[model samples]
Target: QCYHGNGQSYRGTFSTTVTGRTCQSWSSMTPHRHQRTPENYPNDGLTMNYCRNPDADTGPWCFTMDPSIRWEYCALTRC
Candidate 1:
């Protein structure tokens, strides 16, 4: 989980990047920081967390930086 203190295993800001770009999804997604794995997602997946994107894109991106948190594009393509 993302604590204000040191992250699960490593001493980091847990500044992991989920999608450094716009990712599409129909994600019921709570995929958290991969490094701090095994149920490491923090409480309150919504307001407690927010997505990071410098661009003004309509991203259905996962905020938690779980790159694996992608969509099965109806055409069945992965984001």
Candidate 2:
């Protein structure tokens, strides 16, 4: 979930199992600040979350970030 000043937005994709239920999922990329490059990094950043299911297929799902907030890619992890 990406948090803005007064709200939050989430972007994610999920694969369905044979049973037609969601089995795997992944969140959007998030950006963060690094101490080594403090000058180039912003104080606010994003966080990404992902989940994996061996039985499900990977994806290219469509999603939207918060219209109110602006953030660049911070981190990405695949599970």
Candidate 3:
């Protein structure tokens, strides 16, 4: 399991396996909280976000994947 913090909190879990000395892994994440900044904005309180970098290697952190989903947080003031 792993955790990354931004405006709120993000957590993920993964599992790895090795076959013939080659390893591979995969993971999934759940959105904990979603909130807005201005207090009254569109798309507020919606926890519809996907976790990027769900799968990665343990050593040196070398991996590859498709483009991640684009989901912006409501309280994101700075770019």
Candidate 4:
């Protein structure tokens, strides 16, 4: 569901639990607002990217996830 990125436990797979995030101003140096609970994945497909954090402010953040399946986003980047 969640990932710390670049693997932190085994060969490159595990679960930890990360909250969704966004920033109101979309600033690049804001404290960012993280969703404690997950929501529907912002994306509508498989693989490519993942929400990194609030967009520096309060916009939907973005990043890359080579193999994003169905629940990965819902479990990690829901919003």
CA-lDDT, candidates in order? 0.27, 0.25, 0.23, 0.26
Query: Which residue pairs of candidate 2 clash?
Result: 30-74, 30-75, 31-74
* TM-score of every prediction relative to native: 0.17, 0.16, 0.12, 0.15
Please give, for residues 1-79, the per-residue lDDT of candidate 4 as tens digits: 4334321211112222223322122112123332322233232221123333322222223321212311122223222
- Residue pairs in collision within model 4: 22-54, 23-57, 23-58, 24-57, 24-58, 26-57, 27-56, 39-78
Per-residue CA lDDT of candidate 3, range 1-79, in tens?
3434332233222222111111121121222122222233222221222222222312112011212321222221211
How many Å off is the CA of 14 in candidate 2?
7.3
RMSD of 3: 15.1
Best by TM-score: 1
Worst lDDT run of 10 residues, candidate 4, spans 7-16
Clashes of each: 2, 3, 0, 8
Candidate 4 ranges beyond 4 A from true positions:
1-47, 63-79
Off by over 4 Å in 3: 1-30, 37-40, 43-79
Q: Candidate 2: TM-score?
A: 0.16
For candidate 1, the lDDT comes to: 0.27
In candidate 1, what are the lDDT values of residues 1-79, reduced to their tens digit? Answer: 2322112122212223333433222123444322222144343132222332122233212243335543211111122
Worst 10 residues of 1 by lDDT: 70-79
Residue 2's lDDT in candidate 1: 31
